[PDB]
Enzyme design. Structure first.
Site, PDB file in Angstrom:
ATOM      1  N   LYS A 531       0.817  -1.207   0.000  1.00 41.80           N
ATOM      2  CA  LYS A 531       0.000   0.000   0.000  1.00 41.80           C
ATOM      3  C   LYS A 531       0.855   1.263   0.000  1.00 41.80           C
ATOM      4  CE  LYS A 531      -1.794  -1.683   3.764  1.00 41.80           C
ATOM      5  NZ  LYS A 531      -1.513  -3.138   3.676  1.00 41.80           N
ATOM      6  N   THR A 532       1.790   1.371   0.946  1.00 37.92           N
ATOM      7  CA  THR A 532       2.603   2.577   1.055  1.00 37.92           C
ATOM      8  C   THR A 532       3.491   2.790  -0.163  1.00 37.92           C
ATOM      9  OG1 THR A 532       2.663   2.126   3.435  1.00 37.92           O
ATOM     10  CG2 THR A 532       4.094   3.873   2.599  1.00 37.92           C
ATOM     11  N   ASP A 585       0.426   8.186   5.962  1.00 37.80           N
ATOM     12  CA  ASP A 585       0.427   6.736   5.858  1.00 37.80           C
ATOM     13  C   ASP A 585       0.476   6.102   7.242  1.00 37.80           C
ATOM     14  OD1 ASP A 585       3.001   7.206   6.683  1.00 37.80           O
ATOM     15  OD2 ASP A 585       3.939   5.846   5.239  1.00 37.80           O
ATOM     16  N   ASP A 586       0.001   4.861   7.312  1.00 40.49           N
ATOM     17  CA  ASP A 586      -0.085   4.115   8.562  1.00 40.49           C
ATOM     18  C   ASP A 586      -0.877   4.907   9.601  1.00 40.49           C
ATOM     19  OD1 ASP A 586       1.300   2.021   7.458  1.00 40.49           O
ATOM     20  OD2 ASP A 586       2.804   1.909   9.053  1.00 40.49           O
ATOM     21  N   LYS A 613     -11.439  18.046   6.537  1.00 39.71           N
ATOM     22  CA  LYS A 613     -12.660  18.645   6.014  1.00 39.71           C
ATOM     23  C   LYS A 613     -12.577  20.169   5.982  1.00 39.71           C
ATOM     24  CE  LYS A 613     -16.279  16.995   7.984  1.00 39.71           C
ATOM     25  NZ  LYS A 613     -16.568  18.035   9.009  1.00 39.71           N
ATOM     26  N   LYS A 690       5.396  -8.428  -0.851  1.00 34.87           N
ATOM     27  CA  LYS A 690       6.595  -8.271  -0.036  1.00 34.87           C
ATOM     28  C   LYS A 690       7.020  -9.602   0.567  1.00 34.87           C
ATOM     29  CE  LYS A 690       8.662  -5.476   3.603  1.00 34.87           C
ATOM     30  NZ  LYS A 690       9.955  -5.636   2.882  1.00 34.87           N
TER      31      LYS A 690
HETATM   32  N1  ATP Z   1     -30.266  23.174   0.008  1.00 33.47           N
HETATM   33  C1  ATP Z   1     -29.239  23.321  -0.834  1.00 33.47           C
HETATM   34  N2  ATP Z   1     -29.503  23.526  -2.142  1.00 33.47           N
HETATM   35  C2  ATP Z   1     -28.481  23.671  -2.988  1.00 33.47           C
HETATM   36  N3  ATP Z   1     -27.170  23.647  -2.732  1.00 33.47           N
HETATM   37  C3  ATP Z   1     -26.939  23.445  -1.433  1.00 33.47           C
HETATM   38  C4  ATP Z   1     -27.889  23.274  -0.439  1.00 33.47           C
HETATM   39  N4  ATP Z   1     -27.283  23.085   0.794  1.00 33.47           N
HETATM   40  C5  ATP Z   1     -26.004  23.142   0.520  1.00 33.47           C
HETATM   41  N5  ATP Z   1     -25.722  23.362  -0.803  1.00 33.47           N
HETATM   42  C6  ATP Z   1     -24.398  23.465  -1.401  1.00 33.47           C
HETATM   43  O1  ATP Z   1     -23.759  22.236  -1.129  1.00 33.47           O
HETATM   44  C7  ATP Z   1     -22.532  22.421  -0.399  1.00 33.47           C
HETATM   45  C8  ATP Z   1     -22.855  22.137   1.043  1.00 33.47           C
HETATM   46  O2  ATP Z   1     -21.673  21.696   1.742  1.00 33.47           O
HETATM   47  P1  ATP Z   1     -21.612  21.695   3.320  1.00 33.47           P
HETATM   48  O3  ATP Z   1     -20.254  22.006   3.810  1.00 33.47           O
HETATM   49  O4  ATP Z   1     -22.711  22.625   3.824  1.00 33.47           O
HETATM   50  O5  ATP Z   1     -22.056  20.228   3.711  1.00 33.47           O
HETATM   51  P2  ATP Z   1     -22.841  19.537   4.910  1.00 33.47           P
HETATM   52  O6  ATP Z   1     -23.374  18.214   4.540  1.00 33.47           O
HETATM   53  O7  ATP Z   1     -23.868  20.547   5.410  1.00 33.47           O
HETATM   54  O8  ATP Z   1     -21.717  19.424   6.025  1.00 33.47           O
HETATM   55  P3  ATP Z   1     -21.387  18.577   7.336  1.00 33.47           P
HETATM   56  O9  ATP Z   1     -21.340  17.126   6.854  1.00 33.47           O
HETATM   57  O10 ATP Z   1     -20.118  19.045   7.962  1.00 33.47           O
HETATM   58  O11 ATP Z   1     -22.612  18.763   8.231  1.00 33.47           O
HETATM   59  C9  ATP Z   1     -22.192  23.891  -0.608  1.00 33.47           C
HETATM   60  O12 ATP Z   1     -21.604  23.987  -1.899  1.00 33.47           O
HETATM   61  C10 ATP Z   1     -23.571  24.544  -0.703  1.00 33.47           C
HETATM   62  O13 ATP Z   1     -23.448  25.550  -1.698  1.00 33.47           O
HETATM   63  N1  ATP Z   2       3.477  -4.008  -7.964  1.00 35.41           N
HETATM   64  C1  ATP Z   2       3.943  -3.734  -6.742  1.00 35.41           C
HETATM   65  N2  ATP Z   2       3.097  -3.193  -5.837  1.00 35.41           N
HETATM   66  C2  ATP Z   2       3.557  -2.917  -4.614  1.00 35.41           C
HETATM   67  N3  ATP Z   2       4.782  -3.100  -4.120  1.00 35.41           N
HETATM   68  C3  ATP Z   2       5.595  -3.636  -5.033  1.00 35.41           C
HETATM   69  C4  ATP Z   2       5.269  -3.976  -6.336  1.00 35.41           C
HETATM   70  N4  ATP Z   2       6.367  -4.507  -6.995  1.00 35.41           N
HETATM   71  C5  ATP Z   2       7.315  -4.476  -6.090  1.00 35.41           C
HETATM   72  N5  ATP Z   2       6.921  -3.961  -4.884  1.00 35.41           N
HETATM   73  C6  ATP Z   2       7.727  -3.794  -3.684  1.00 35.41           C
HETATM   74  O1  ATP Z   2       6.895  -4.129  -2.604  1.00 35.41           O
HETATM   75  C7  ATP Z   2       7.294  -3.392  -1.430  1.00 35.41           C
HETATM   76  C8  ATP Z   2       6.039  -2.765  -0.888  1.00 35.41           C
HETATM   77  O2  ATP Z   2       6.004  -2.881   0.549  1.00 35.41           O
HETATM   78  P1  ATP Z   2       5.386  -1.737   1.442  1.00 35.41           P
HETATM   79  O3  ATP Z   2       6.428  -0.834   1.971  1.00 35.41           O
HETATM   80  O4  ATP Z   2       4.304  -1.046   0.618  1.00 35.41           O
HETATM   81  O5  ATP Z   2       4.641  -2.513   2.601  1.00 35.41           O
HETATM   82  P2  ATP Z   2       3.180  -2.521   3.231  1.00 35.41           P
HETATM   83  O6  ATP Z   2       2.310  -3.541   2.616  1.00 35.41           O
HETATM   84  O7  ATP Z   2       2.663  -1.087   3.170  1.00 35.41           O
HETATM   85  O8  ATP Z   2       3.477  -2.831   4.751  1.00 35.41           O
HETATM   86  P3  ATP Z   2       2.823  -2.611   6.184  1.00 35.41           P
HETATM   87  O9  ATP Z   2       1.792  -3.652   6.451  1.00 35.41           O
HETATM   88  O10 ATP Z   2       4.003  -2.646   7.156  1.00 35.41           O
HETATM   89  O11 ATP Z   2       2.252  -1.191   6.128  1.00 35.41           O
HETATM   90  C9  ATP Z   2       8.262  -2.317  -1.930  1.00 35.41           C
HETATM   91  O12 ATP Z   2       9.568  -2.827  -1.696  1.00 35.41           O
HETATM   92  C10 ATP Z   2       8.065  -2.330  -3.448  1.00 35.41           C
HETATM   93  O13 ATP Z   2       9.362  -2.190  -4.008  1.00 35.41           O
HETATM   94 MG    MG Z   3     -19.948  21.497   8.210  1.00 31.97          MG
HETATM   95 MG    MG Z   4       3.547  -0.524   4.820  1.00 31.17          MG
END
Ligand code: ATP
Ligand code: ATP
Ligand code: MG
Ligand code: MG
Ligand code: ATP
Ligand code: ADP
Lengths: 722, 214, 107
Positions: A531-532, A585-586, A613, A690
């Site tokens: 993943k990393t 990561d992690d 957020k 790995k």
């Molecule tokens: N009733 C609505 N009609 C149209 N557009 C809206 C409406 N309410 C919100 N929006 C738009 O959608 C987005 C709303 O994002 P917002 O941060 O308010 O999300 P939220 O779900 O209320 O947040 P949180 O999960 O933190 O409670 C903004 O772009 C706002 O312009």
């Molecule tokens: N296709 C591939 N995808 C991912 N890793 C690859 C690939 N080919 C080779 N590798 C090798 O795999 C290793 C990836 O291991 P990595 O550091 O991502 O561990 P991890 O799964 O995140 O570990 P942990 O569980 O500790 O978080 C790297 O050495 C990378 O070089």
């Molecule tokens: Mg909010």
């Molecule tokens: Mg890792």
């Protein structure tokens, strides 16, 4: 007349849509009649009715602009009542209409005759009701425009016999004035162009090129207008006006963006002295009696000059530095406040304060009478870089030592997030490499006069110097990648192709969109699945000027507050660029999780939830990538609502995949490959990449006879149920 | 006119009026100055040096920033992409908000009224409160959000909330907004592990009549 | 070159000679730099001190181009007790983080 409840409908034809008249049935009303539409007790609108056969009885049709303006939805019920206009007073004399292009795809710079627009508007919308703020679509010369009503004025009495009104009736003799919308590219010509809100500021005509400063115009103008503007008029007039000269300025910004030049250059614009630098930390000297003594010594010259000349001495300046350290010590702050403000103070002083931390600054020191004008100096944009490069490369261009191949625009485009102090360094590096080009110094240091002619700096000189000499601060971290992606990336099956493909469909959206300036994605999978090592391979290909990795290994033994502060600092640094990408990561280790209990730090979780957020300042973009191995635990804490999307990196789960991966690694021969294929083609496989690499490395140590046997035994032992 | 300027400055402190007057003169007198290799006082148009309404208007909009007055950045980044109708609920919510904000201004038996919005997550319940606050038209409009308390302990949160609420008792009208009440209390269902020193102050504050006639 | 870092765990019943046998393998390694970290040297220390000791030991080990660090009795280091259970979280976190951080290139 009393009012009847109708139903909203859609406009039947485009021609009626452009007429701005609601379409009704003949059985219900007649053409030209004006009605009032009620959607709520506090929502009333006036419309002009036109009759069309296609309108079903009992319903009223509105065009899309009308619905948006009146907040109407198709199928919703409305009340319609006949409306009568008092022509004696509601007759309209003049209009002021804000006109803007309806469609951005059809914007053109061709001129438009407003006189013809007014005549067409009158010829079309005569005997129609209009209200302030109404939005409509007007067609002229087969071109669509969005018109917004701004002002309405009453009509004057007839000859035989400018009141402001909210609604009226348009007639043949009404006048229309067109004004382009804010930042509109529409070009209007004619006498029907009167506008309003014509308020601005007139400033002296400066010549920035001859100075040295480029890309900082508004800040310079504002500072000169607000601080030094009242130290050049004769002393008689200022006394009459009763003004009091300002005594403080606080400029803050990143390090090396022209903060000190913006003061030194203006210093010599006015016949005056030169600044006396005073370091921020140097004034903190051990014990009292030296710090205070020096502080007193700072103002001795100004005091003596004032005593000698009274209210006729020249102005002095004190370029401060790192005021954050000196303040929050307290004795110094009190002494400075007494010297500047109070009863005994000088009137020929002006303190210029500089700092990098704007929030840590004390509050008591920022208030009218004290340091008041606070200004910010930010990184330069493309135009600033262009001007800076032009100014810093003028002397060379004057002597004809610059090759015609050098293009300043390309260099400006390529250089991203450069502060401005480095832009100077780039030119010096280019000159140095060009000079070193011609040094034929083998055997003994000498000079190659044969090619010494035209000691130019060709594009290659700039580009060759841009990769081995200058390291931008808010720039790419090019050393981390060598430690994370250690053994390349191997395409051992279809999944790797898909995941990497996603790495594009997100990375592009964060760069070519404006309704979503923040995106997130949570990568997860079984342990030891890689993943990393798949997050860096995307963040690198993203081609972003700023990249960072907030790994947990750099913080060992820290306490909760330290981790929170470090994360906040990293994010604050990331906030200051036009583009960025932050990899965390992690996550499970950041929370300090352990299955017993459970136990974890309740503060880091809240900080992380809040951070994921919070949108950045306007016009800037961000992208956050996660990495975890325990998805269920993260779901219990209600953390997958913060992230916008997730991806599933799988594990090797077929014999074909194992064989192909072993082949691509290119270790074993054909006979051993065949033997392994025969032996392992009757069982299921569940192994991480790995782990596969580690097993191959371990098994290669044995003698050639029993390599395959050891590898197969290890694989059998490692095999486990999904 | 001086009378008109006394109706567009609301909740302006005493010293900020002096500040406005001072800043209304630099702009007026910054026009009559020409610099060419050195700042030189203009001579042809030195006379007629009169301060005009334009200077006052420009200074009132971009010079003095009040302290106990309406902000322009807090409720500028919250509502992001406007509000667009998609049915009845939007109209209902807006109408109810308007009714409440008019009751809290034309009543004498109930100086304090509080309303709680709620719904499912990701529904837009933080861009429908900033709109009501901006349409309220009250002189004093603040926004207390958890975005400015990252890493704080419980005591710091209590102090910040108390100060913000206290600042609202110094004006004849006030509107206040609290966002993500669930985040101030630090709720986490591996528990719960709420904070009992903030929940026993938030309850008390919501029932406290202002000093008098506010 | 594909596995610059390798770790191995020895487990067995109590009093089976696990503590001392590993020192034999360490001695036969012939590596220029060797070191053993044991809880015996750390008596009466606070939790915040053992983490610093481990960090310093590993930092010193990083410098050379070959090393072999041995940690004995991983359980007693945590202060683990069957009742509870109880232990020190910080030491466990330091141990878990430090067992996967590879050294600089080529070491
Ligand atoms: N009733 C609505 N009609 C149209 N557009 C809206 C409406 N309410 C919100 N929006 C738009 O959608 C987005 C709303 O994002 P917002 O941060 O308010 O999300 P939220 O779900 O209320 O947040 P949180 O999960 O933190 O409670 C903004 O772009 C706002 O312009
Ligand atoms: N296709 C591939 N995808 C991912 N890793 C690859 C690939 N080919 C080779 N590798 C090798 O795999 C290793 C990836 O291991 P990595 O550091 O991502 O561990 P991890 O799964 O995140 O570990 P942990 O569980 O500790 O978080 C790297 O050495 C990378 O070089
Ligand atoms: Mg909010
Ligand atoms: Mg890792
Ligand atoms: N063949 C042998 N293998 C291992 N140890 C041996 C052997 N013969 C004698 N010994 C002795 O047994 C002891 C084993 O070391 P030690 O007792 O510290 O380990 P341990 O009993 O596993 O410790 P702990 O119980 O703390 O894990 C040493 O004194 C060692 O010299
Ligand atoms: N806007 C600008 N235009 C041209 N040159 C600049 C600009 N800003 C900075 N520089 C160059 O960078 C240097 C800035 O140094 P300075 O600002 O005094 O350092 P600091 O910002 O740490 O006080 C100067 O030598 C100047 O030539």
């Amino acid at each position: 007349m009393a009012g009847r409840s109708m139903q909203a409908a859609r406009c039947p034809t485009d021609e009626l849509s452009l007429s701005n008249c609601a379409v009704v049935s003949e059985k219900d009303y007649q053409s030209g009649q004006h009605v009032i539409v009620r959607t709520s007790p506090n929502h009333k609108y006036i419309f002009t009715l036109r009759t069309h056969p296609s309108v079903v009885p009992g319903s009223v049709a509105f065009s899309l602009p009308q619905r948006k303006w009146a907040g109407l939805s198709i199928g919703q019920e409305i009340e319609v009542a006949l409306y009568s206009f008092d022509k004696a007073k509601q007759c309209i004399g003049t209009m002021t209409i804000e006109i803007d292009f309806l469609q951005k795809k059809n914007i053109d710079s061709n001129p438009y005759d407003t006189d013809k627009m007014a005549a067409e508007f009158i010829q079309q919308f005569n005997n129609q009701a209009f209200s302030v703020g109404q939005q409509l679509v007007f067609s002229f010369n087969d071109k669509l425009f969005g018109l917004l009503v701004k002002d309405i004025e009453a009509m004057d009495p007839s000859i035989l016999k400018r009141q402001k009104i909210e609604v009226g009736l348009v007639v043949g003799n009404s006048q229309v004035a067109f004004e382009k919308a804010e930042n509109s590219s529409l070009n209007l010509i004619g006498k029907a162009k009167t506008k309003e809100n014509r308020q601005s500021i007139i400033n002296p005509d400066w010549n920035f090129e001859k100075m040295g400063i480029g890309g900082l115009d508004k800040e310079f103008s504002d500072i000169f207008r607000r601080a030094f503007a009242s130290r050049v008029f004769p002393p008689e007039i200022v006394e009459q006006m009763g003004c009091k000269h300002v005594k403080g300025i606080l400029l803050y910004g990143p390090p090396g963006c022209g903060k000190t030049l913006l003061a030194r250059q203006i210093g010599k614009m006015l016949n005056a002295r030169e600044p006396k630098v005073v370091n921020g930390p140097e004034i903190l000297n051990k014990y009292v009696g030296e710090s205070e003594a020096n502080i007193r010594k700072l103002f001795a010259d100004a005091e003596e000059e004032q005593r000698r000349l009274g209210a006729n001495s020249g102005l002095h300046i004190i370029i401060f530095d790192e005021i954050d350290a000196i303040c929050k010590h307290d004795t110094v702050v009190n002494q400075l406040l007494s010297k500047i403000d109070g009863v005994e103070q000088l009137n020929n002083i002006l303190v210029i304060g500089m700092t990098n931390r704007p929030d840590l600054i004390d509050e008591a020191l920022l208030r009218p009478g004290r340091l008041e004008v606070k200004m910010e100096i930010g990184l330069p944009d493309e135009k600033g870089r262009l001007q800076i490069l032009h100014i810093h490369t003028a002397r060379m261009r004057g002597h004809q030592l610059l090759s015609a191949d050098v293009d300043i625009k390309e260099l400006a485009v390529e250089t991203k997030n450069f502060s401005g102090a480095e832009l100077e360094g780039l030119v010096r590096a280019a000159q140095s490499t060009a000079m070193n080009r011609h040094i034929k110094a083998s055997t003994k240091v000498e000079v190659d006069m044969e090619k010494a002619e035209s000691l130019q700096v060709t594009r290659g000189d700039f580009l060759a110097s841009l990769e081995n000499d200058i390291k931008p601060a808010f720039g790419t971290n090019q050393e981390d990648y060598a430690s994370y992606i250690m053994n390349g990336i191997i395409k051992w099956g279809d999944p790797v192709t898909r995941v990497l493909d996603d790495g594009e469909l997100l990375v592009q959206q964060t760069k070519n969109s404006d309704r979503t300036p923040l995106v997130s994605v949570l990568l997860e999978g079984p342990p030891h699945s890689g993943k990393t090592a798949l997050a860096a391979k995307i963040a690198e290909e993203s081609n972003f000027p700023f990249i960072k990795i907030c790994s947990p290994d750099k913080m060992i033994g820290f306490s909760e507050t330290a981790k929170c502060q470090a994360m906040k600092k990293i994010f604050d640094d990331a906030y200051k660029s036009q583009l960025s990408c932050v990899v965390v990561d992690d996550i499970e280790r950041l929370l300090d999780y352990v299955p017993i209990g459970p136990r974890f730090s309740n503060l880091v979780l809240q900080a992380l939830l809040v951070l994921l957020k919070k949108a950045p300042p306007q016009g800037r973009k961000l992208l956050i990538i996660g990495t975890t191995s325990r998805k269920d635990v993260l779901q219990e804490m209600e953390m997958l609502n913060a992230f916008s999307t997730t991806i599933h990196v799988p594990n090797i789960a077929t014999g074909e995949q194992l064989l192909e991966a072993l082949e691509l690694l290119g270790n074993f021969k054909d006979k051993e490959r065949t033997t392994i294929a025969q032996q392992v083609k009757g069982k299921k496989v569940w192994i991480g990449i790995k782990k596969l690499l580690m097993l191959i490395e371990m098994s290669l140590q044995m003698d050639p006879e029993y390599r395959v046997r050891k590898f197969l035994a290890l694989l059998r032992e490692e095999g486990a149920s999904p």
